[PDB]
């Protein structure tokens, strides 16, 4: 079970937060600032795995913008990386050569790709075509 989804820049600026566990905003800032401090203070041959507070945390560096999640520590761990890679391909297919400013200016569309890809922490569409087709159909409703 994915407890949260975090997207933070290299400088530490929060670009996307998501909470699949309802913890309050002071706890949100505490946990978010802690995770931002942890991942930015770790090297480049460290497996992209952190055991942080009963969570086998799954992050990945794709660019200066860093991505972060944490699956429940009883599941497989590499599939969370495949989830993040699939969502990268979702942003690339709906946005088109997805820039940082595409994530900056059009963040709500990335939130909606996340909504039509994962609710509750789990994958709701495994097709890389049906999900982007459905969000282009919902955009076609406008």
């Amino acid at each position: 079970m994915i407890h949260f989804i975090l997207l933070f820049s290299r400088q530490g600026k929060l670009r996307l937060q998501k909470w699949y566990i309802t913890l309050p905003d002071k706890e949100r800032k505490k946990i978010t600032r802690e995770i931002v401090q942890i991942i930015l203070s770790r090297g480049h041959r460290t497996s992209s795995f952190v055991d942080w507070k009963e969570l086998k945390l799954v992050y990945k560096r794709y660019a200066s913008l860093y991505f972060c999640c944490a699956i429940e520590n009883q599941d497989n761990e590499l599939l969370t990386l495949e989830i993040v890679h699939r969502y990268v391909e979702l942003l690339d297919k709906y946005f088109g050569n997805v820039c940082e400013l595409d994530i900056i200016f059009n963040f709500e569309k990335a939130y909606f790709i996340l909504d039509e890809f994962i609710i509750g922490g789990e994958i709701q569409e495994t097709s890389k075509k049906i999900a982007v087709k459905a969000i282009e159909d919902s955009d076609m409703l406008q």
């Binding site: 794709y62 690339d92 050569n97 820039c99 940082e100 400013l101 900056i104």
Partner: peptide
């Protein structure tokens, strides 16, 4: 800048 790079490079 360093922001205009696309992520996945399809």
């Amino acid at each position: 800048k360093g922001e205009n790079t696309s992520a996945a490079h399809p």
